RNA sequence: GACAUUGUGAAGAGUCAGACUCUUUACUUAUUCGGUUAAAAGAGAAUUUCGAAGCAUUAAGCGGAGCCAUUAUGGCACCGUGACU
RNA sequence: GACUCCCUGGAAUUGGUUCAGCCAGAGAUGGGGACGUUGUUUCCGAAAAGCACCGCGUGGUGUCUCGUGCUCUUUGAACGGCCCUUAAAACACCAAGGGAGGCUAUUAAUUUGCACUCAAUCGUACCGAUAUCCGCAUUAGGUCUCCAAGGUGAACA
């Protein structure tokens, strides 16, 4: 047969992101002697709409330490950052809503979000809208601290991982039902070619491992094994379980 | 050590000399082709032509391809004594280089026609 | 005094006045050759090194070297200057000399002809070398590892050579080649049994051995 | 899974007769990943927030020694500190 | 020259105001001012042009006063609606902060205005379609755009 569209997808060309318009990536400032040893303050001279994205991008500027210029940085706002608020950034800042701090410094319970994968890779966890992290434990010992991610994981960083303290703004975004297909068009047009979805059953057997018969039907388990070919991984793939969720999970 | 100030490291400026070659790569000087005689080729006496030099003050010339509108000057200057105060050059469907010369008020195009020859 | 000569002092903390032009030599981001050089210093300082490696690095101390090389020098070969005023009063018409060449030197003391050795203490490839030393020791011929075959070469008349031997001195210099031997044997033949048995190397950086000897008080408090 | 890249230390067990094998653990220099315009890392020494949409650059001060012109007055020029090792 | 901005002053018995909005003790109404792109002229260009007419074998006369609009096109102003859609980048010019520096009260630095020289190279014809293109061709096919009169009529039917 021939590739699948899913085969086809990693070859970047017609499925590469759409970002002329796009306005930066939403990072913390490096980390540095100010963020280390102190804080730095910096004003949120704007709050603007990243196409492609859901949660709004802060503009903050910034005073370079070591010469007369400004810095200019980008990141996701937390719900409640307007224009001409100061942001406090470092291990000094106090807990108020947009400061960025080291996670170790928070009580038990605080929301945080742009948080820190690795100490120094500038925010990596809960940057979609209206989404957070919780600080759930520290361990003064090792210097780490627990936290839980917005899908419901709990996982282990360093106490000096980074995070903006507050939730993302935006949130409650996928409470409107996109009522229209003209919706999902204009959405994905400014994000990637991944719609419209043409099911695996519609297609014929030369295209998808689904296609074909007199009746369409997928006619083999839909549940595919983790280690299949690249041709073949369709499906629920390494699913540990199938049909409806009945009780939590 | 070398103190140093900045974080960034520059490549060292280095003396560099002019070339002082043992010999000369070509023995002598090609010489200008483009002189003013192979810049102007050959009048053009056509009627249009015609009508020109004797209504506007303007020689029509056939004129090399190479040559710019500085060149047409200064070659008409060379070969006719005649100043121009503004030279229009063409290049024709045949790929032909024509050029409308306007000779200052001084001078009489019909006469340096005539002298020429083309007329 | 003028009153109009205040002096304004600048705060130089977090958040205030730019920071003046301090040095900042250990953050410089150095070419890769310049960081190949330091690397491999440090690579050499960490691993552990065999004893026959490892005996290069203990070298005449500084006052063995300059009178070594105070010896040396009285023999230098023939200058360029000397060699230009001899050609031409020969056409009008062999002292004791420094001996090098790792080949010449493998000879002579093969040979039993040497009476003292002196190796450069980094030649690269070491293996052109590595040998000396034991060779030396087993025809019991005098020999010490010495500081620069930059400065032997020097003494000789080149740029780099490495290794040398003295192979006949004059009596005016009988005394000082013995007094040298003796200098040589007390520090590299008679310590062979520590010499073959000495591992170098090892060695930690600053920080890393800060951290060990804070975890050693924390443990032991 | 095995072998090589693959180095340096501890503890336990088992084999032997100081070695090997494993299991756990520690180190960093091989290796790998990340940040940065490679900008304050580690040891030691002294001992900016009532969350105000302003500016912050081409050193003041102190100390030490110099030069030029007619003691002095003029003008012109360095070093250290300020900026801890 | 709408919008915007400034000064005075202090508003409920609330006012101003658009087709629609909306605005005001964070200073409305009233009164008086500032700015500016689009644009207009009993003005120069300029009637010595063009146009219309009358003659001669190169002349002459006139080219003027007004109105009107749910009218169209283009331009401009000011707003409002829409987005899980938010609607380029570079070059170049200008401005501001800064005050390193520069000339030394009949000198000088320095702007201002006139006068002067120059502005290279390549394309420029014509068709652009029921015959100049693609389709075997002078083929009922296909092939990107700009300008758009009167009547009837809602109307580029």
């Given at each position: 047969?021939?590739?699948?569209?899913?085969?086809?997808?990693?070859?970047?060309?017609?499925?590469?992101?759409?970002?002329?318009?796009?306005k930066?990536?939403s990072?913390?400032?490096?980390?540095?002697?100010?963020?280390?040893?102190?804080?730095?303050?910096?004003?949120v001279?704007?709050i603007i709409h990243d196409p492609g994205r859901g949660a709004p991008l802060a503009?903050?500027?910034?005073?370079?330490?070591?010469?007369?210029?400004?810095?200019?940085?980008?990141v996701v706002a937390a719900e409640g950052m307007h224009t001409?608020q100061?942001?406090?950034?470092?291990?000094?800042?106090?807990?108020?809503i947009g400061?960025?701090?080291?996670?170790?410094?928070?009580?038990?319970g605080t929301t945080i979000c742009n948080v820190?994968?690795?100490?120094?890779?500038?925010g990596?966890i809960a940057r979609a809208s209206g989404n957070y992290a919780t600080?759930?434990?520290?361990?003064?010992?090792?210097?780490?601290?627990?936290?839980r991610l917005p899908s419901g994981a709990?996982?282990?960083?360093?106490?000096?991982?980074?995070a903006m303290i507050g939730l993302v703004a935006g949130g409650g975004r996928t409470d409107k039902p996109l009522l229209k297909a003209g919706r999902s068009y204009h959405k994905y047009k400014a994000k990637?070619?991944?719609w419209?979805?043409?099911?695996?059953?519609?297609?014929?057997?030369?295209?998808?491992?689904?296609?074909?018969?007199?009746?369409?039907?997928?006619?083999?388990?839909?549940?595919?094994?983790?280690?299949?070919?690249?041709?073949?991984?369709?499906?629920?793939?390494?699913?540990?379980?199938?049909?409806?969720?009945?009780?939590?999970? | 050590?070398?103190?140093?100030?900045?974080?960034?490291?520059?490549?060292?400026?280095?003396?560099?000399?002019?070339?002082?070659?043992?010999?000369?790569?070509?023995?002598?000087?090609?010489?200008?082709?483009?002189?003013?005689?192979?810049?102007?080729?050959?009048?053009?006496?056509?009627?249009?032509?015609?009508?020109?030099?004797?209504?506007?003050?303007?020689?029509?010339?056939?004129?090399?391809?190479?040559?710019?509108?500085?060149?047409?000057?200064?070659?008409?200057?060379?070969?006719?004594?005649?100043?121009?105060?503004?030279?229009?050059?063409?290049?024709?469907?045949?790929?032909?280089?024509?050029?409308?010369?306007?000779?200052?008020?001084?001078?009489?195009?019909?006469?340096?026609?005539?002298?020429?020859?083309?007329? | 005094?003028?009153?109009?000569?205040?002096?304004?002092?600048?705060?130089?903390?977090?958040?205030?006045?730019?920071?003046?032009?301090?040095?900042?030599?250990?953050?410089?981001?150095?070419?890769?050759?310049?960081?190949?050089?330091?690397?491999?210093?440090?690579?050499?300082?960490?691993?552990?090194?065999?004893?026959?490696?490892?005996?290069?690095?203990?070298?005449?101390?500084?006052?063995?070297?300059?009178?070594?090389?105070?010896?040396?020098?009285?023999?230098?070969?023939?200058?360029?200057?000397?060699?230009?005023?001899?050609?031409?009063?020969?056409?009008?018409?062999?002292?004791?000399?420094?001996?090098?060449?790792?080949?010449?030197?493998?000879?002579?003391?093969?040979?039993?002809?040497?009476?003292?050795?002196?190796?450069?203490?980094?030649?690269?490839?070491?293996?052109?070398?590595?040998?000396?030393?034991?060779?030396?020791?087993?025809?019991?011929?005098?020999?010490?590892?010495?500081?620069?075959?930059?400065?032997?070469?020097?003494?000789?008349?080149?740029?780099?050579?490495?290794?040398?031997?003295?192979?006949?001195?004059?009596?005016?210099?009988?005394?000082?080649?013995?007094?040298?031997?003796?200098?040589?044997?007390?520090?590299?033949?008679?310590?062979?049994?520590?010499?073959?048995?000495?591992?170098?190397?090892?060695?930690?950086?600053?920080?890393?051995?800060?951290?060990?000897?804070?975890?050693?008080?924390?443990?032991?408090?």
């Open positions: 047969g021939r590739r699948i569209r899913i085969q086809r997808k990693g070859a970047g060309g017609i499925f590469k992101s759409h970002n002329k318009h796009r930066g990536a990072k913390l400032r490096p980390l540095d002697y100010a963020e280390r040893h102190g804080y730095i303050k910096g004003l001279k704007d503009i903050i500027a910034f005073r370079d330490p070591y010469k007369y210029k400004t810095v200019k940085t980008t001409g100061f942001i406090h950034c470092g291990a000094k800042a106090q807990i108020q400061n960025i701090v080291p996670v170790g410094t928070l009580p038990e820190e994968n690795k100490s120094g890779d500038r990596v600080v759930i434990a520290h361990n003064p010992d090792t210097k780490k601290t627990r936290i709990k996982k282990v960083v360093q106490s000096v991982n980074r990637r070619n991944s419209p979805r043409v099911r695996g059953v519609a297609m014929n057997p030369v295209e998808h491992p689904h296609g074909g018969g007199n009746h369409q039907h997928i006619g083999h388990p839909s549940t595919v094994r983790r280690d299949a070919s690249a041709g073949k991984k369709v499906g629920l793939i390494a699913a540990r379980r199938t049909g409806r969720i009945r009780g939590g999970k | 050590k070398n103190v140093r100030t900045s974080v960034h490291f520059r490549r060292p400026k280095t003396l560099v000399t002019a070339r002082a070659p043992r010999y000369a790569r070509k023995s002598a000087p090609a010489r200008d082709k483009l002189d003013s005689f192979a810049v102007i080729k050959a009048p053009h006496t056509t009627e249009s032509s015609m009508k020109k030099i004797e209504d506007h003050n303007t020689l029509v010339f056939i004129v090399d391809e190479k040559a710019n509108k500085h060149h047409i000057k200064r070659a008409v200057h060379a070969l006719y004594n005649v100043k121009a105060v503004k030279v229009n050059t063409l290049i024709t469907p045949l790929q032909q280089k024509k050029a409308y010369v306007r000779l200052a008020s001084d001078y009489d195009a019909l006469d340096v026609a005539n002298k020429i020859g083309f007329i | 005094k003028n009153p109009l000569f205040e002096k304004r002092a600048r705060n130089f903390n977090i958040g205030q006045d730019i920071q003046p032009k301090k040095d900042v030599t250990r953050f410089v981001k150095w070419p890769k050759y310049i960081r190949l050089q330091r690397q491999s210093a440090i690579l050499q300082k960490r691993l552990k090194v065999p004893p026959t490696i490892n005996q290069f690095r203990t070298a005449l101390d500084s006052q063995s070297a300059r009178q070594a090389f105070k010896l040396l020098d009285k023999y230098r070969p023939e200058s360029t200057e000397a060699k230009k005023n001899r050609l031409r009063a020969r056409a009008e018409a062999r002292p004791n000399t420094v001996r090098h060449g790792v080949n010449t030197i493998t000879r002579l003391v093969e040979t039993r002809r040497a009476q003292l050795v002196l190796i450069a203490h980094d030649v690269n490839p070491l293996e052109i070398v590595l040998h000396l030393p034991a060779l030396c020791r087993k025809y019991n011929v005098p020999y010490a590892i010495i500081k620069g075959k930059a400065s032997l070469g020097t003494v000789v008349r080149r740029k780099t050579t490495a290794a040398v031997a003295l192979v006949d001195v004059n009596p005016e210099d009988k005394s000082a080649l013995n007094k040298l031997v003796e200098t040589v044997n007390n520090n590299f033949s008679e310590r062979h049994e520590e010499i073959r048995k000495h591992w170098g190397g090892g060695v930690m950086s600053a920080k890393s051995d800060a951290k060990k000897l804070k975890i050693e008080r924390a443990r032991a408090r």
